[PDB]
Amino acid sequence: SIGDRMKRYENAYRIKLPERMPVIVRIDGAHFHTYTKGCAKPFDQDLAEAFWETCKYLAQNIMGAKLVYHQSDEISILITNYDKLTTQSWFENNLQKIASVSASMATAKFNEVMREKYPDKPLATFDGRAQVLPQDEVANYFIWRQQDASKNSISMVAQANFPNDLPVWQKRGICIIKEFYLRSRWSVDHETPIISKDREYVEQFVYL
Amino acid sequence: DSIGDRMKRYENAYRIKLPERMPVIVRIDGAHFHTYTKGCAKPFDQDLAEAFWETCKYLAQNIMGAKLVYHQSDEISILITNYDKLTTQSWFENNLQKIASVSASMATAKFNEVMREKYPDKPLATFDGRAQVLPQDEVANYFIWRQQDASKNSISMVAQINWNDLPVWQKRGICIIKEFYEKNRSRWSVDHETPIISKDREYVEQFVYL
Amino acid sequence: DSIGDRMKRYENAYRIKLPERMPVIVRIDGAHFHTYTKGCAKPFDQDLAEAFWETCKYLAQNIMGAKLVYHQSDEISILITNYDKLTTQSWFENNLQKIASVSASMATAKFNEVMREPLATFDGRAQVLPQDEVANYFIWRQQDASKNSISMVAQANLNGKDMQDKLINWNDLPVWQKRGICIIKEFYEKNLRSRWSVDHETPIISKDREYVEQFVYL
Amino acid sequence: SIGDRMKRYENAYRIKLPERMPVIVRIDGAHFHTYTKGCAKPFDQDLAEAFWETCKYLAQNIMGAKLVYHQSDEISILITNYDKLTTQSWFENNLQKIASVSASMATAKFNEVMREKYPDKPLATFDGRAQVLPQDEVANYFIWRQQDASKNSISMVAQANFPHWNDLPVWQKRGICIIKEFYLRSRWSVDHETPIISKDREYVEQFVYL
Ligand SMILES: Nc1nc2c(ncn2[C@@H]2O[C@H](COP(=O)(O)OP(=O)(O)OP(=O)(O)O)[C@@H](O)[C@H]2O)c(=O)[nH]1
Ligand SMILES: Nc1nc2c(ncn2[C@@H]2O[C@H](COP(=O)(O)OP(=O)(O)OP(=O)(O)O)[C@@H](O)[C@H]2O)c(=O)[nH]1
Ligand SMILES: Nc1nc2c(ncn2[C@@H]2O[C@H](COP(=O)(O)OP(=O)(O)OP(=O)(O)O)[C@@H](O)[C@H]2O)c(=O)[nH]1
Ligand SMILES: Nc1nc2c(ncn2[C@@H]2O[C@H](COP(=O)(O)OP(=O)(O)OP(=O)(O)O)[C@@H](O)[C@H]2O)c(=O)[nH]1
Ligand SMILES: Nc1nc2c(ncn2[C@@H]2O[C@H](COP(=O)(O)OP(=O)(O)OP(=O)(O)O)[C@@H](O)[C@H]2O)c(=O)[nH]1
Ligand SMILES: Nc1nc2c(ncn2[C@@H]2O[C@H](COP(=O)(O)OP(=O)(O)OP(=O)(O)O)[C@@H](O)[C@H]2O)c(=O)[nH]1
Ligand SMILES: [Mg+2]
Ligand SMILES: [Mg+2]
Ligand SMILES: [Mg+2]
Ligand SMILES: [Mg+2]
Ligand SMILES: [Mg+2]
Ligand SMILES: [Mg+2]
Ligand SMILES: [Mg+2]
Ligand SMILES: [Mg+2]
Ligand SMILES: [Mg+2]
Ligand SMILES: [Mg+2]
Ligand SMILES: [Mg+2]
């Protein structure tokens, strides 16, 4: 056949992550330094809330999503596929499919939320990447990301003053977690802890 | 720094790059469109395709190395070359995940924007993207394999009356190509006179063998 | 310099690395060993087996992070851990093509020196496993080892249980003829020394999972 | 079953090279700086002669092998798999299988040849890597290695007389090649008249462009 030939060229880059391992997917904004030219400083409230709604939507549509952390213009999502013994994988851990769909989902909701408040704003695009992490390295990832949060935070505030203790999401970002009330829901945790002081906040979704 | 170096190695473990100076094909297919096209008209919705055609142009405009964009059903195939000269650079330096995700993202934002207008309240449409490389002699055969699947889907959609009288886009899908016009220049435009590539192979190979 | 950078980009396109701090398994199967073992005894050749046992030792003595080397038929599996400490380095920095080739190269180098008393060649592949699957791997190889052994004895001269039922006691046969064999580091006294030994009393991993899990969990 | 799940982990690193494309395989000696301690300087005949035979054995067993180039302790091999429309790739372009069996092949033979003259010599080991190249670069690759071989040749010769030339044979100056020779029988022989590729581009491209 010729479909066998063409599909063969395709499969040469059909990469699959090994299963039963933590999966972290990061979605950073594409050229947001130009996109946030009209946004306010040091932090834009409307811009931050757009991510929060976007993070929920991602968590609501991604199989195995347990935790979503937001900062600056990036979104990181912890995905587990070893909850039970027969737990299925999202797209069978198809590397390209995970990175693209997540980016696509984060692109759809973010735009539709932003355009409601800003109908003249240009389209916003996102890049996505996937990776695996050993269990003992999952908490260290979000710590490393949160240390990047605070560093960027103090740099953004000091840039206004010359060339004390801001709110939570302005200091170390926030997370979107599962909440119970018996039904399940995702909600923005404004009381986000410093992960280095409360590692179990992440590890509760890692070791299970 | 120290902790960032360790984390980067895990990330770089799946930092795959496509080899340079080779034809690149990015296919962007719509996720769960069988559910999404519930309200759309059968067998051919002119507004459904027009939203794709507006997206195809958007993709070709922003994707570095874009030469041709063939549309069919719910999928979009983009041909990319990075060997136009010796100083030619690749899109995102041929980062596999980045090309696949940015493309699927660009396709998503433009499609929803067009569809939102004149259809208020429609559910969000999403896309998945994949990248690959092809030897020059196989590039034409890729589109033929795609143009053949189009006609297969076309006649099967008509069934569930002359088929050959139907428009070229309903029968064989429609490519979009950079057209040259005079004003005061280049311009991406939809080719409604899209030929049967199996017959006219140079229609695609013209961008391949540069 | 400039040209070299260009070529390297093509080469680096397939410089793939396994994620670190994760159990790495390397399997080395023989190439065309059906032809190679023509002069060898059936169902089992003692001289052919002992060569692998020396090869497994040679490998373990040289693979950085090697903890367990299981032998069976014409295959050689090796458990490699790189998370023993906090500053534990990875063999070749987990370069996939490298550890797959140097392994096969090593096994080739020794297996020919021993047997020279044609040429045998090998293939090598590497992968990572989650901690709770390492045990299941060697079990899978060991269970496969038994099936081949029962099917080999029955031959000269349907299901595996049916063949065992008919056929000369099979359980009377030694361990290596039954469920393959492992080689591990043993600690002995000759005055507190250490060496890689061929564990002739290799347990059924399905029964004794800790036999392998001791190398997976610190 | 458990067998299906286990093969799944394995398949996660069962990488395949794209087909209909030049495949270059490089085989380099592992820590030969130690192995060649007993060997002469700057150019050891018996060491190089062992590689020449190894290059024969490699080309005699690699499906699609066209050209083999020897330098220092490395061995490069050009592999095409598009000579015909039905040409099959070696090991179906399995990256790990190509890389490993190649190095295993080299190791098995190199130790056999070297043992004839040096029975006291320790075991030699090789590492193998595999890649693909667009046709434009195949000649360039071998030039890159050959220009590298020339640099080292001049420097190493300069080591013996001063601390810190064209009269020397070809292999001591710019390495050597192994091509299939026709005499109607065929055989892989050592081209002792191996040209400077940068001048004779067709010497390599003749296997590339078919
Ligand atoms: N004013 C304002 N700018 C922000 C805010 N959050 C993110 N940004 C902008 O987003 C950028 C984040 O860093 P990057 O993601 O590396 O910037 P980039 O130009 O998008 O680079 P790429 O991610 O590679 O596209 C910063 O430079 C800021 O200018 C915000 O809350 N307010
Ligand atoms: N009404 C209408 N439906 C279409 C049109 N084009 C494609 N479709 C629908 O899209 C489907 C194409 O098959 P798929 O691409 O596999 O549909 P899918 O649900 O997106 O499945 P995935 O490819 O896995 O994402 C067909 O079954 C059609 O029902 C169109 O032009 N008009
Ligand atoms: N220009 C350039 N040359 C390199 C680079 N890396 C290695 N080389 C040279 O290219 C030659 C090819 O031999 P290799 O075995 O691939 O080099 P290497 O440094 O050992 O690379 P590894 O074996 O993967 O560790 C070596 O002699 C190096 O000196 C590079 O990144 N850029
Ligand atoms: N007579 C005999 N043959 C053996 C013995 N051990 C292994 N073999 C041979 O080794 C083979 C093991 O299966 P494979 O590894 O698939 O054989 P292969 O020919 O190397 O196939 P590939 O691995 O794909 O190259 C059997 O077919 C046997 O013929 C032995 O102890 N005695
Ligand atoms: N359950 C299961 N078993 C498999 C599968 N593939 C291979 N096996 C068995 O597992 C054993 C592993 O041997 P391999 O080295 O992979 O031999 P192979 O099947 O030729 O694989 P390659 O040499 O890479 O082509 C084989 O003897 C097969 O009988 C699979 O997909 N599922
Ligand atoms: N005496 C002698 N030594 C040689 C000759 N050719 C190569 N060598 C040795 O082979 C070595 C090749 O160096 P590299 O390939 O860059 O690295 P390596 O020493 O093999 O170590 P690795 O590549 O990391 O395994 C040189 O350092 C030389 O010492 C030769 O003709 N005569
Ligand atoms: Mg980025
Ligand atoms: Mg950004
Ligand atoms: Mg950022
Ligand atoms: Mg679809
Ligand atoms: Mg489709
Ligand atoms: Mg076998
Ligand atoms: Mg096999
Ligand atoms: Mg074998
Ligand atoms: Mg090297
Ligand atoms: Mg070397
Ligand atoms: Mg070398």
Side-chain angles (χ1 to χ4, degrees), chain A residues 1-4 6 8-23 25-36 38 40 42-83 85-87 89-115 118-119 121-146 148-150 152-153 155 158 160 163-165 167-170 173-178 180-181 185-190 192-208, chain B residues 4-19 21-33 35-37 39-41 43-45 47-49 51-53 55-63 65-83 86-115 117 119-120 123-147 149-151 153-154 156 158-159 162-163 166-167 169-170 173 175-178 180-181 183-192 194-198 200-209, chain C residues 1 4-37 39-41 43-45 47-84 86-109 111-112 114-115 118-142 144-146 148-151 153-154 156 160 162 165 169-172 174 176-177 180-185 187-188 192-196 198-200 202-217, chain D residues 1-6 8-23 25-36 38 40 42-48 50-82 84-114 118-119 122-150 152-156 158-161 163 166 168-172 174-184 187-192 194-210:
Chain A
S1 307
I2 86 167
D4 298 336
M6 242 58 225
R8 197 176 298 114
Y9 287 103
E10 181 182 348
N11 299 329
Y13 292 101
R14 188 176 198 85
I15 308 182
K16 293 183 174 301
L17 306 167
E19 298 176 352
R20 307 201 70 89
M21 298 179 186
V23 177
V25 180
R26 197 156 76 260
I27 303 176
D28 194 284
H31 283 334
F32 254 60
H33 187 51
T34 309
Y35 180 83
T36 60
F43 310 104
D44 191 279
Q45 182 75 8
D46 294 327
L47 197 257
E49 294 178 0
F51 280 97
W52 297 353
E53 295 291 329
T54 304
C55 291
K56 297 194 196 66
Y57 179 85
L58 293 172
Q60 292 172 4
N61 298 268
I62 294 181
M63 186 177 304
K66 307 301 175 180
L67 175 58
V68 174
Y69 173 78
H70 165 59
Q71 168 260 341
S72 182
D73 63 333
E74 67 158 54
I75 300 178
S76 302
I77 307 173
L78 171 62
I79 308 171
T80 64
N81 50 329
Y82 50 91
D83 311 271
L85 194 65
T86 54
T87 302
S89 296
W90 191 30
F91 299 141
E92 274 71 29
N93 287 135
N94 186 284
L95 179 60
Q96 303 197 62
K97 214 170 196 300
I98 296 180
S100 57
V101 169
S102 299
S104 177
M105 290 183 303
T107 303
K109 229 295 179 300
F110 183 86
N111 282 276
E112 94 140 353
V113 162
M114 207 68 180
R115 295 290 294 276
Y118 305 90
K121 264 254 184 331
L123 301 184
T125 56
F126 295 94
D127 62 89
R129 65 190 71 182
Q131 68 188 246
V132 293
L133 281 182
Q135 290 179 304
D136 37 315
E137 290 277 34
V138 186
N140 298 269
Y141 168 79
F142 292 98
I143 291 173
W144 166 66
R145 286 286 86 199
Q146 203 175 45
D148 188 37
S150 302
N152 179 86
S153 181
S155 179
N164 170 87
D165 184 86
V168 186
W169 62 267
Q170 295 190 340
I174 32 71
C175 282
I176 277 69
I177 29 75
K178 259 287 181 55
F180 294 83
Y181 66 102
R185 73 147 199 259
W186 294 90
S187 58
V188 176
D189 185 46
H190 293 87
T192 300
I194 282 77
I195 311 300
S196 71
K197 286 178 169 59
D198 193 26
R199 300 180 72 262
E200 189 60 29
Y201 181 63
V202 173
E203 288 191 347
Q204 60 164 325
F205 304 108
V206 177
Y207 302 92
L208 37 71
Chain B
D5 288 327
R6 213 185 333 116
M7 293 296 100
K8 273 300 180 183
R9 275 190 271 96
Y10 291 105
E11 180 190 343
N12 296 332
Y14 285 86
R15 182 180 175 85
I16 280 80
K17 296 180 182 296
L18 302 174
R21 295 190 66 83
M22 308 206 319
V24 177
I25 287 79
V26 185
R27 188 156 68 260
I28 310 180
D29 184 270
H32 301 276
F33 252 67
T35 306
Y36 181 80
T37 55
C40 295
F44 290 90
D45 195 329
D47 300 271
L48 188 272
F52 271 104
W53 301 343
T55 298
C56 289
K57 291 182 296 181
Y58 183 81
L59 287 169
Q61 285 165 356
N62 305 123
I63 293 185
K67 294 294 187 301
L68 186 73
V69 178
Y70 170 81
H71 169 258
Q72 167 224 354
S73 175
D74 66 319
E75 66 177 66
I76 294 179
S77 292
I78 302 94
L79 173 59
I80 308 171
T81 55
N82 56 91
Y83 46 89
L86 303 187
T87 72
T88 313
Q89 305 291 343
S90 296
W91 195 32
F92 293 118
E93 295 132 29
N94 272 145
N95 182 6
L96 180 70
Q97 295 187 71
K98 205 160 187 179
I99 294 175
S101 55
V102 168
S103 301
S105 171
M106 284 180 176
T108 304
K110 186 61 177 180
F111 186 88
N112 292 270
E113 175 207 88
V114 174
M115 271 299 182
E117 302 185 49
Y119 277 129
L124 293 177
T126 53
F127 292 93
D128 77 275
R130 70 193 69 195
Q132 66 174 111
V133 292
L134 277 187
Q136 290 182 123
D137 29 304
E138 288 286 345
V139 187
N141 296 277
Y142 170 78
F143 290 101
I144 295 179
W145 173 64
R146 291 289 81 196
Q147 199 180 37
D149 193 36
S151 302
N153 289 281
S154 189
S156 180
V158 176
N162 183 27
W163 184 89
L166 292 180
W169 71 271
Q170 294 197 9
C175 297
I176 84 108
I177 323 187
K178 177 182 296 179
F180 294 94
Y181 70 103
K183 213 77 238 62
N184 305 123
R185 301 182 175 184
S186 61
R187 169 170 58 183
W188 292 101
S189 183
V190 175
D191 192 349
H192 295 267
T194 302
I196 300 183
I197 311 177
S198 178
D200 184 25
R201 301 175 57 94
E202 195 68 20
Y203 175 79
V204 172
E205 291 188 18
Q206 55 163 317
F207 313 103
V208 178
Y209 304 85
Chain C
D1 203 338
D5 281 18
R6 207 201 321 134
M7 293 298 101
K8 275 302 177 184
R9 290 199 292 267
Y10 292 116
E11 183 189 334
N12 290 326
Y14 297 90
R15 186 184 188 88
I16 316 181
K17 292 178 178 299
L18 304 176
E20 294 172 358
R21 306 202 66 85
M22 213 170 303
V24 163
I25 293 289
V26 175
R27 190 169 73 257
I28 298 185
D29 199 283
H32 291 150
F33 258 54
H34 175 72
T35 301
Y36 180 79
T37 65
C40 297
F44 312 101
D45 184 40
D47 305 278
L48 191 271
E50 294 185 8
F52 281 106
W53 298 352
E54 177 70 18
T55 298
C56 291
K57 284 187 299 176
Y58 180 68
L59 278 173
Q61 288 172 6
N62 298 280
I63 314 302
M64 192 179 75
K67 257 62 178 182
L68 222 197
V69 184
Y70 173 74
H71 165 58
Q72 163 249 331
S73 185
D74 69 325
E75 89 162 38
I76 291 185
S77 301
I78 296 182
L79 177 54
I80 307 170
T81 54
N82 62 112
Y83 52 100
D84 317 28
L86 263 298
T87 333
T88 302
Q89 303 298 292
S90 295
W91 195 39
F92 292 117
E93 306 179 330
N94 273 11
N95 193 283
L96 180 68
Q97 298 191 47
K98 208 130 193 173
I99 77 187
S101 49
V102 181
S103 293
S105 179
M106 280 183 180
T108 310
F111 188 86
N112 287 328
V114 180
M115 288 293 296
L119 283 183
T121 52
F122 295 90
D123 73 89
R125 70 203 63 187
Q127 73 188 44
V128 294
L129 275 175
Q131 293 175 156
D132 47 302
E133 286 280 41
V134 182
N136 301 21
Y137 171 81
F138 291 97
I139 288 175
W140 168 55
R141 304 277 75 242
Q142 206 178 47
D144 183 34
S146 295
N148 300 335
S149 58
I150 300 176
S151 182
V153 175
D162 302 25
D165 204 342
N169 181 25
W170 181 83
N171 287 91
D172 207 345
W176 68 273
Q177 295 186 0
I181 206 170
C182 291
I183 75 104
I184 2 178
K185 209 164 190 177
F187 314 92
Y188 63 103
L192 197 61
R193 310 257 193 87
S194 53
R195 71 188 167 202
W196 292 91
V198 195
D199 183 24
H200 289 275
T202 296
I204 304 178
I205 318 296
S206 176
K207 308 294 176 55
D208 194 22
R209 294 176 65 96
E210 181 61 24
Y211 179 68
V212 176
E213 285 178 344
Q214 52 175 313
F215 309 106
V216 190
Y217 304 95
Chain D
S1 58
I2 83 288
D4 309 320
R5 187 184 51 171
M6 230 68 215
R8 193 168 312 136
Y9 290 107
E10 179 178 337
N11 290 325
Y13 296 95
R14 191 189 182 93
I15 311 302
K16 288 183 184 296
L17 298 173
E19 292 189 324
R20 297 189 66 81
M21 227 167 301
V23 162
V25 177
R26 192 159 72 255
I27 294 183
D28 187 87
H31 57 61
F32 255 60
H33 175 79
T34 307
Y35 180 86
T36 60
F43 311 118
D44 189 279
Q45 171 80 24
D46 297 313
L47 171 62
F51 276 102
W52 298 344
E53 281 301 312
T54 301
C55 294
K56 294 180 186 178
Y57 182 67
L58 285 180
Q60 287 163 19
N61 295 281
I62 293 180
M63 166 183 294
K66 298 307 175 187
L67 172 60
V68 182
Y69 172 72
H70 165 52
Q71 165 207 356
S72 180
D73 66 321
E74 68 151 61
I75 295 179
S76 303
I77 289 183
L78 172 56
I79 302 172
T80 60
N81 54 282
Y82 54 88
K84 302 163 69 176
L85 274 309
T86 54
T87 309
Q88 300 301 119
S89 290
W90 197 29
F91 291 132
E92 299 177 307
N93 266 9
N94 196 326
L95 180 71
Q96 293 199 55
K97 209 158 204 306
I98 288 176
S100 44
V101 182
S102 297
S104 169
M105 231 145 51
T107 303
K109 194 66 169 60
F110 186 84
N111 288 316
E112 168 180 317
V113 171
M114 210 76 183
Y118 307 86
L123 297 182
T125 46
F126 296 85
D127 75 273
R129 64 197 66 194
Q131 56 168 312
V132 290
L133 285 170
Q135 294 174 144
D136 320 31
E137 301 280 24
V138 190
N140 298 262
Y141 169 84
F142 285 81
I143 291 175
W144 169 54
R145 308 271 73 250
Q146 195 185 41
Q147 287 176 346
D148 173 81
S150 294
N152 179 261
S153 178
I154 301 174
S155 70
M156 289 308 179
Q159 302 287 268
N161 211 274
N166 304 264
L168 284 79
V170 284
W171 65 272
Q172 294 187 1
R174 55 176 183 267
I176 217 63
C177 271
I178 281 82
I179 33 178
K180 192 194 297 297
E181 195 190 59
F182 303 93
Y183 65 100
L184 291 196
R187 75 170 194 263
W188 292 90
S189 66
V190 178
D191 194 349
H192 300 285
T194 301
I196 304 182
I197 310 297
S198 66
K199 296 177 173 53
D200 203 330
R201 309 269 306 204
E202 186 60 27
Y203 183 86
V204 172
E205 289 181 346
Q206 64 173 315
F207 303 107
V208 186
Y209 296 101
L210 308 181

